[PDB]
A paper describes a structure:
PGAM5 is a mitochondrial membrane protein that functions as an atypical Ser/Thr phosphatase and is a regulator of oxidative stress response, necroptosis, and autophagy. Phosphoglycerate mutase family member 5 (PGAM5) is a mitochondrial membrane protein that belongs to the phosphoglycerate mutase (PGAM) branch of the histidine acid phosphatase superfamily, known also as two-histidine phosphatase (2H-phosphatase). Overall, the catalytic domain of PGAM5 adopted a classical phosphoglycerate mutase-like fold with the canonical three-layer sandwich topology, which featured a six-stranded β sheet flanked on both sides by α helices with the first four parallel strands arranged in an alternated β/α manner.
To provide high-resolution details of the catalytic center, we also determined the high-resolution structure of ΔN90-PGAM5 in complex with phosphate. The β3-α3 loop was the region that showed the highest degree of flexibility with two major conformations observed, an opened form in the apo and off states and a closed form in the on state (root-mean-square deviation [RMSD] of ∼0.9 Å with an average Cα shift of ∼3.9 Å for residues 175–179). Binding of a phosphate ion induced a number of rearrangements in the active site resulting in two distinct on and off states, which were termed in relation to the “in” and “out” conformation of H105, respectively. In the on state, in addition to H105 all catalytic residues were observed to assume a potentially catalytically active position. This conformation was most likely induced by the closure of the β3-α3 loop which moved E177 inward, triggering an inward swing of H230. In a concerted manner, the “in” H230 likely forced an approximately 90° rotation of R152 side chain orienting perpendicular to H105 and planar to Y108 for cation-π stacking. In comparison, the stark difference of the off state of the enzyme was characterized by an “out” position of H105, rotating away from its catalytically competent position. Although this conformation maintained affinity for phosphate, the all-out rearrangement of the catalytic residues presumably depicted a catalytically incompetent state of the enzyme.
Numbering used by the authors:
A (entry chain B): -1 to 0, 90 to 179, 192 to 289
B (entry chain A): -1 to 0, 90 to 182, 192 to 289
Write the structure that this text describes.
Amino acid sequence: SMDHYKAKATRHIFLIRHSQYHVDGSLEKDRTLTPLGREQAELTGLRLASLGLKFNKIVHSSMTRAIETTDIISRHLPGVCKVSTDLLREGAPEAVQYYEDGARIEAAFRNYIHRADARQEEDSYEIFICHANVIRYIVCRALQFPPEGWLRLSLNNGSITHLVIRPNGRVALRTLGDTGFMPPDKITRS
Amino acid sequence: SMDHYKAKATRHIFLIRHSQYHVDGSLEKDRTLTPLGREQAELTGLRLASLGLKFNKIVHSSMTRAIETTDIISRHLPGVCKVSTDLLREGAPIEPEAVQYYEDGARIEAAFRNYIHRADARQEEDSYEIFICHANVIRYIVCRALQFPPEGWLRLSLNNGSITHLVIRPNGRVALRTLGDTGFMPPDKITRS
């Protein structure tokens, strides 16, 4: 169980990886989703809406692929409120930047996963639209797995990862990197 | 990842949990799939057939629930041989005497070493292998192959008929590509028991 964790209720955390995008955009402006990526986000959006859950929020960063993945999914989840955060931004001396980028991933974990809400009386269902690296960090961290193994988790574009966090901080992984709802010819990791 | 491992090509391991069944069945022969369980198995079969992979083999637990799940899945994978093994029968629950657990631990380790860790010197191309079994068996194999601690077993929750996909590189690096995938099943067909 996560240490120093008390919540009022159970929290269901859904971590969605960005869909495929033009990684060769000169400026962020240009790193939009590929046509395949747009279809992926659509499929992830239909899947999420089909769950019969009233989601509490969709948290995401300000990167072009993040905003675009979010926009598409969000149209399937009418009324669910969106929250922009730069703790989910993926960075782009070099060495000092990278340390800082890593520290931000931990802050993301701390701020959004390890921290529970006092207002929250009942079970919550929370979506986070993220880059691969923050998902796999969050998974290892919440599950108390060796952080050195985070890169052993291979997350498809648009995939859904579901963690369950009980009031006493016991955590269960119900699924990781699910793209079972996409036709196999639509699945990508880049 | 795995130590003392050198394979000639990549190995894709698909670990499939059995479909919903009659837990109340009085003998092992009575613990057959429910009608919903048979629908789940069908869905998993459809999904596996749709990946466009030539599966090398279907290795399955000899428990009735695992047999019936395999019967249904294998109809979608014509020409893939099926091999029954006692090594993949479910282990005693982690959440009941100690010699039972020693026995089960030893067997499931044997299963891991025989089916997951052992590279075939006759492999001549990338392989795709299906193992139809049980939650504790899969949890153990996943954690062992990824070097996750034994307290991780019970933190992994696998749906009935779910697909867990590991990729084993020739030098022994292991990636977890998906765990507990039932994303191909409508939510109103999804169960854990």
